[PDB]
Design a protein around this ligand. Sequence first.
Ligand SMILES: COC(=O)c1c(C)n[nH]c1-c1ccno1
Ligand SMILES: CSc1nc(C)nc(N)n1
Ligand SMILES: [Mg+2]
Length: 208
Amino acid sequence: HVETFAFQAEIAQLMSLIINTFYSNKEIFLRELISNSSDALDKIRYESLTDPSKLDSGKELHINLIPNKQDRTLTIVDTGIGMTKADLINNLGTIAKSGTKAFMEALQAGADISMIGQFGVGFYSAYLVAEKVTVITKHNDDEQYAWESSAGGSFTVRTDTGEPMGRGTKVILHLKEDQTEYLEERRIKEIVKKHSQFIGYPITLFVE
Ligand SMILES: COC(=O)c1c(C)n[nH]c1-c1ccno1
Ligand SMILES: CSc1nc(C)nc(N)n1
Ligand SMILES: [Mg+2]
């Protein structure tokens, strides 16, 4: 039972700017996602200080980077707070709608694309490198869901029949054919050390 939702107008505009603009410096996509996982780990750590039962779905707080040349994907996996179904459909768009307008208004005035994080929309930097993004995510309060979009103004949501994951977010990045460099162990190490040396959680880079 796959449901299809149109992106709010503003967001669909952002996602295009990212997909079509000439920007050579695409590696920022990673520290954004990694940063995003970190914020998500942060939220659960804190919540669990008052509710130790919130960690009954996973005590380990970590980020994994999992490259896959075969199915041409880079995945960032976190055991963060994860996203309820309302997050995916309603909430995160409402935050991101203001987030975008600010980001966009700052783009003439001469800020660049790498400052996307300060505007609350780093997630979308994933489109600098991916042709389609899939998001597996599990919140304590809701069931497990698959979100997915290849942009073009729309995105789907479905309850997921995959491996259960206790709690977290997987972000599967289905890379564009000219972006397979973000699949290489040495290349990933370089961006992690360069942009994310001071993340507060173990980032394991998997090898093949
Ligand atoms: C996991 O991907 C996301 O976080 C997401 C979705 C599914 N919609 N909007 C957003 C978002 C994140 C940050 N700003 O927006
Ligand atoms: C609320 S959970 C979340 N959110 C984001 C933007 N990212 C991640 N990894 N998790
Ligand atoms: Mg591990």
